[model samples]
Target: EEEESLAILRRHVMNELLDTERAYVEELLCVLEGYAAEMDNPLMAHLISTGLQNKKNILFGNMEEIYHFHNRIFLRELESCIDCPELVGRCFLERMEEFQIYEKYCQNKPRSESLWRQCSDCPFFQECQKKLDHKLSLDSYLLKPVQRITKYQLLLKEMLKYSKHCEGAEDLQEALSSILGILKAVNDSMHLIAITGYDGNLGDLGKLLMQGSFSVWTDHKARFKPMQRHLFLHEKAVLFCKKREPSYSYKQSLNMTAVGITENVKGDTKKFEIWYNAREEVYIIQAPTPEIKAAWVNEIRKVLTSQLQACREASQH
Candidate 1:
């Protein structure tokens, strides 16, 4: 057989996914019970009563809303997938889009973060943090909400890698796309930036095939505000990004086989566009010169042509 899948691998990954969901629930509980619910802590109240800290939900933002959604609702949905593992993607594709609560949670961080950073200087605040008995500091809990959504993303992609030869692999792809939609919905989020900030090995994004700066573009009939973007073409996917200092901040990626690529840009050979099929995303790229354009177009076409068979196999599955 040209392709084979281990039944045990799917079961193992499925357990990992469920295990993390359970663990995430507890961690959210730790923060929710230990801190977010403590708005009335005498010191917090005292600090807010004074000019010492700004309150009125700034303290924990809308995390309680998130807790109820995940613990009370979504996680249970995901839990049922343990019995029918194939439906894991079904869980995400149907409900994961509702996580826009995460976008609201992002802006809430710096204000709450600065308040705690300054409040940490006070002895009572320090003592109060320890009173939670949660072992982890309040600050760490605050960082937790924004990060875990990306973990769901990583696990989805991880699941797909093992899922390809199995039936209905396209189901997993839709789940990954749903997660990415949330990743895109929450603008500041991306898998690698999440990686560069934290986490151990997340597996490879296929071998690096080509990389360079390209004038990257976007969606909706929105005015074309092209950002100076970088491209990293992998064997399986091509990632788009902008500079995030210590490392490349991920912007987006396209499956080579699935995307519609046009090599010539009519008036300018230095320019090109990638039509992200099924994803209304149309990226028109601009290279610095003919040489660079040639490099990008050729490697991309090579990957697209080479992987042509896999795309057919995908449709069959």
Candidate 2:
């Protein structure tokens, strides 16, 4: 009978959901309660612990309703029920929004040196490492909750197959669409900030071209004084920064449309000159190897040419 088959489907889907939900809860508690508690500073530990605790509470509340279903429903007569699927879809989506907030909170927090080194040296840190299958650090574990959002949608699709004519089928599909939209927005923001390493506006440099270290002529007053620094090639400019600081903190930036690169300057084997037309100045810089100097000069020249052409086209428009 149609009723009997639908009953079988519900049981199978609920079993899958319950099994995975149990494992997800265990992983969170293991890290937040166990590993994070062992961290050196209490304030640093609470930063992660507080959000994770809120996550656990949300999951546990919904989990209780699932346990009640198992006890009240007998196998044969379960065809009379539509409560389980309805409860799962509604609760899962509501809690997911709160979880997204927790993720963004962690993102905005300043990753201070003291807190980083302290957690890295924690004894339980090694234990948490075994749980991760990637080369990512402990903070990466926060993403696990967001990642699980995909699994919920997958299970909902499977649940829909057997409930084609059932009333709850439409509800399940709506839940799937809502969660998918949220996941895409969250992922897009994270990806842009990850690749550029600049949390703010990128201006005309829509993307990063190349970045590396070179000996720059810092003291260009009368003599050539070289300081090891990092260079970033962007779509709009060639920016350089001090090696001791982060790349995002650039010290000097030159417009790509007005810059020129000359190879083998001053007869130095690995040296090059960058002439800035607007500033009416030239600086001699060196790379560690001849090959590196050649690569830098070639890439810089290509980007500069392309940028200048783009500028001309814009002006014409």
Candidate 3:
């Protein structure tokens, strides 16, 4: 009844907090509640709601109780299954060669968005975002990898100093550098940056005959790094709303099974990031159990929709 997403996020966040941070969280709760007492503003509603949500997200992310909060701003955003549609489609397209009909099917097919709009309109949008924020936080999205590399560097140094391996210090350093290079390359590949300047003049070109005049091509679609599913949500929401009408109410559907994950996100994908990132941290960066992620994402989305509707209402005020 007190907004389930807020409760879960608060639970997770509070678990992860240090004595000082937890104290701060408690302090903020008082301040936020105090503000709510003074004003009926809906924007404040979410702020208070998120303050509540963070109570748990923080606890979830702090597995060791030593995991300090990283980014203080922004949620990771829970993307609806629409988020997966594109990824699934892409995978399908990549294997198009195997399914001959698919090539034809794809050519005329409307573009499948990796985002969902109706989900955003649902009341749970905010909570979904909050959970996603947790997800990224657990991954230490920025910090843990850095720490890992540093540890590896130290390990290499120590190995060189004592172990009589065939490789000398220079070799170990080179190996390290090489590994780093590979890592960089993998990063670049993931971001699609490495393919830009690749040489096209590789061997065996003569064996391949081009019927048409030869030319190079590149995918022109814009790149969204880290593959967020929410960026397209607003548009999707608009589309969904237009298909219906202005006074429509977006609520959780009854079609969802009690024990399964459903495609639910508030129309805006960005907001859920806050909660999602935090949850990721709490879940220790593992893909959340379907039931847990679904419920949490949905609850956050509800918070988002409430905030968004309030914003809309305020504009009229």
Candidate 4:
């Protein structure tokens, strides 16, 4: 009976995951169609010019992209995994980078929350809330995206917990790690602040773009020797760290814009090199696979080109 109960419980959580996910999509629409539609009124310009105008709670927390991604893509992605629940983890792992969108939403949410408070006090704002047909308050709707993120984490945790002798347990754990990392980042308020040894504001570093533990070698010190390193790649900075038993040790951080990257160093497709500025000391590293190496290079190039664009624009001044 106990064994059977556990299986049923697992099924229950899986069902809840799908059910709530569908509901979550609707909640996003409540923001996009319900609240945002009401505010799109030209008359809201009156509210805008009326001091609280600049507070665009109408498009609160960058939900357009969030809504678009989930409603069209991620929702279907989750549904496809339902037929073979074991592949659910695989789905998450394959799309890990896309999930970074949540970090963007999380980072901006604080300001959205702050703006809600500032606007809610106004008479027009109260009327707008009344005009909104959603049963949930505007404050509640604004909070949904963050809450949805936590919900996914919880659903995955429960799924993993019940997955005894499960074929997917390992992949599920990896996917769970991805979600937890994002949750941790959000909860800590981008605690990169704590990890960073630099005097600059950690917030300037921007949201973490990628993180991994790899064997790294600095050219000046050791040509072939490799040291295991945990690196956090952010938009403005790259944090270097050492993973320890009791606690992970923070080493140092560098301006990502000042870093140079090289892909596929000749004979080895899995090997790549990076150096400070133009060519300080080429620090070489190898990813576990050539595929991962390409992903890193792709993301790095994205960060690189954006800064280069700004570099070119600076001359106009």
| Best-performing candidate as measured by TM-score | 4
Q: Please report how far candidate 2 places residue 287 from its true position, in Å.
A: 38
Q: Which model scores highest in lDDT?
A: 4
Candidate 1 residues 1-317, lDDT tens each? 23324556667778988888788778878777665555556755753445543463686888788888888888888888775565578778777557778877876776777677767566545655678655667778777788888888888788777777666577789988877876664553332333232233323556565566787766434466779877767777877767675257666657666778778877677987788766477778889997888887887888877788666667856
Clashes of 1: 0
Q: How many clashes show up in model 2?
A: 0
State in Å the error of residue 101, model 4.
0.9
Please provide TM-scores, in order, for all candidate models, with all chains considered together.
0.58, 0.42, 0.18, 0.58
Ranked by lDDT, the better of candidates 1 and 4 is 4
- Supply candidate 3's per-residue lDDT for 179: 41
Candidate 4 residue pairs that clash: 48-53
Candidate 2: stretches off by over 4 Å: 40-83, 93-96, 102-124, 127-143, 195-317
What lDDT is obtained when candidate 3 is compared to the true structure?
0.28
lDDT of candidate 2?
0.57
Error of 2 at 307 (Å): 30
lDDT of 4 by residue, 207-264 (tens): 6777776778777535566888777778877777776641346787767767778876
List CA RMSD, all candidates: 12.9, 13.7, 27.6, 11.4
lDDT value, residue 98 of candidate 1: 72
For model 4, the stretches where C-alpha displacement exceeds 4 angstroms are 1-7, 47-54, 57-59, 189-317
- CA shift of 254, model 2, Å: 22
